[PDB]
Design a binder for this molecule. Structure first.
Ligand SMILES: C[n+]1cn([C@@H]2O[C@H](COP(=O)(O)OP(=O)(O)OP(=O)(O)O)[C@@H](O)[C@H]2O)c2nc(N)[nH]c(=O)c21
Ligand SMILES: [Mg+2]
Length: 215
């Protein structure tokens, strides 16, 4: 197993309301876990526990190795689009190009005369929300890691572009990698190896899409 939570409960504030309550799941190496639930359900807080930023008050957690995290809030730093995606990791042309194709960024980049050297974050280009989201996702996917934590990464995308990038990036390009994707979309839940739906900190459902259909 690469990631396990067993009977996990946690609090952000000593003696507040628990942000996660008796949570259970397991992901084997290379699988995809979909994490769903309404705002404030605890999805980002669950990822923070995996990243060691929130400690359990009850229960056990297993994970090892390097993490790459994609925030639900896209961001860019001053530098070229290539520098933003590689973000300090060593460069490889094939890997970089594979990521930007999987993220549909090749189309955007081909329209600038400076191509991958277009400068972001310095008052020239103002990117759209969807462009900034795809760059943020590409940054997280380019990094080599044992576990990818993708927190609602499809912000501002129309539903067909979201579907296409889910399929080319999260399912195909990342097929061999352990992934946790925070997402609400039916096709993502259907393609995941497991689904965890959170509601106000609790496990509303944990199992497969097939199991849920049989209910
Ligand atoms: C991300 N985060 C959330 N909280 C609070 O933890 C509770 C669960 O908040 P959440 O951010 O985990 O919910 P979720 O990611 O499901 O919501 P969404 O992104 O809108 O879809 C809420 O009370 C937050 O205010 C947080 N509280 C502290 N103290 N530190 C944090 O980093 C933090
Ligand atoms: Mg969140």
């Amino acid at each position: 197993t690469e990631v396990v939570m067993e009977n996990v409960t946690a609090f952000w504030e000593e003696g507040g309301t628990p942000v996660l309550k008796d949570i259970n799941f397991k992901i084997e190496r290379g699988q995809l876990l979909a994490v769903a639930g309404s705002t404030g359900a605890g999805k980002t807080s669950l990822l923070m526990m995996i990243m060691g930023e929130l400690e359990p008050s009850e229960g056990k957690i297993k994970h090892s190795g390097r993490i790459s995290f994609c925030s639900q809030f896209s961001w860019i730093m001053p530098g070229t689009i290539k520098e933003n995606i590689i973000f300090g990791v060593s460069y490889d042309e094939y890997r970089y190009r594979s990521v930007i194709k999987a993220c549909q960024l090749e189309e955007d980049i081909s329209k600038f005369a400076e191509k991958d050297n277009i400068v972001l974050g310095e008052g020239g280009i103002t990117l759209s929300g969807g462009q900034r989201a795809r760059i943020s996702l590409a940054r997280a996917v380019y990094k080599d890691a044992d576990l990818y934590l993708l927190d609602s990464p499809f912000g501002y995308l129309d539903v067909l572009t979201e579907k296409e990038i889910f399929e080319s990036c999260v399912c195909k390009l990342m097929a061999n990698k352990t992934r946790i994707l925070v997402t609400s979309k039916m096709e993502h839940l259907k393609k995941a190896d497991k689904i965890l739906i959170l509601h106000e900190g609790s496990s509303y459902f944990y199992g497969t899409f097939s199991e849920l259909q049989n209910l």
